[PDB]
């Protein structure tokens, strides 16, 4: 049944609660972003109103075939009224179209649901700065101090430099980038840009990327694999067998693959710097795991919460074990005591 951390008290609202059937006493279903654990349950036979960003709206219509009359897109950074309640959607710095939602309850309570986010100091100057938040429903994916990772900018620098070096040394090398969901598009677009290539991909992936309002996208992507020297493939296929097989497919156009697996965290991060990362190699194939995260590090999360000073924190990730729950509640108390709220 629908867990308490997906219900918004004092409203007829739920967030990311599409796999429990008709939720008793829900008049509007919000969707924070188009990732499968969050949309799980939506389909073309959904007949309740869905509130979301413009981008998430394009994906619901075009990928899931939800009928248009049920899709209610809202602009960002704008005060809107839904079933008599003021709401605002804010950029979550997650994947394209991902939002946080501010709810202004009739009784005066203000609630922030972060959805999935990567906390950034730029958020300290949105409509969030203007009033007090009583309850915070928080993306706690990496809520433990061992989770450090570099900035998205440093990781992209590493990938750009690595790819450019390899292809300039061997013009017959192919670069492959794994994907299994929207998000992390900068990886493959930044690499293609330094190489003067378009990114080649399947028709299903091309379709997905056309929903995202990325400027000049027609100039950056294609379904013609042969004309492109950056290929996207399903993440599952980023391994020596899958890559050997793909190399066969290119018809002796290429004699070397350099591949990138964007991962979240990987325990190599406790000891090693981004400058220091090395590939796994077999023959003429090299695979790089790069720590490109679209979730808050532990320090980013802590800084955001200490700035916001909520009265109550409700975790939405890692809530399934008592040991996880108790670990997280300990960090929340430290944060609050260190900062004085
Ligand atoms: Ni997500």
UniProtKB/Swiss-Prot annotation:
Protein function: May be required for DNA interstrand cross-link repair. Also required for checkpoint mediated cell cycle arrest in early prophase in response to mitotic spindle poisons. Possesses beta-lactamase activity, catalyzing the hydrolysis of penicillin G and nitrocefin. Exhibits no activity towards other beta-lactam antibiotic classes including cephalosporins (cefotaxime) and carbapenems (imipenem).
Species: Homo sapiens (Human)
Localization: Nucleus
GO biological process, one term: cell division
Family: Belongs to the DNA repair metallo-beta-lactamase (DRMBL) family.
Official protein name in the record: DNA cross-link repair 1A protein
Keywords of this entry: Cell cycle, Cell division, DNA damage, DNA repair, Hydrolase, Isopeptide bond, Metal-binding, Mitosis, Nucleus, Phosphoprotein, Ubl conjugation, Zinc, Zinc-finger
Subunit structure: Binds constitutively to TP53BP1. Binds CDC27, which is itself a component of the anaphase promoting complex (APC). Binds PIAS1.
Keyword DNA repair: yes
Major localization listed first in the record, in broad terms: nucleus
GO molecular function terms attached to this record: 5'-3' DNA exonuclease activity; beta-lactamase activity; damaged DNA binding; zinc ion binding
Tissues showing expression: Expressed in brain, heart, kidney, liver, pancreas, placenta and skeletal muscle.
Domain of life: Eukaryota
GO CC terms of this entry: fibrillar center; nucleoplasm
Factors inducing expression: During mitosis. The mRNA encoding this protein contains an internal ribosome entry site (IRES) in its 5'-UTR. This 5'-UTR generally suppresses translation while specifically promoting expression during mitosis, when cap-dependent translation may be impaired.
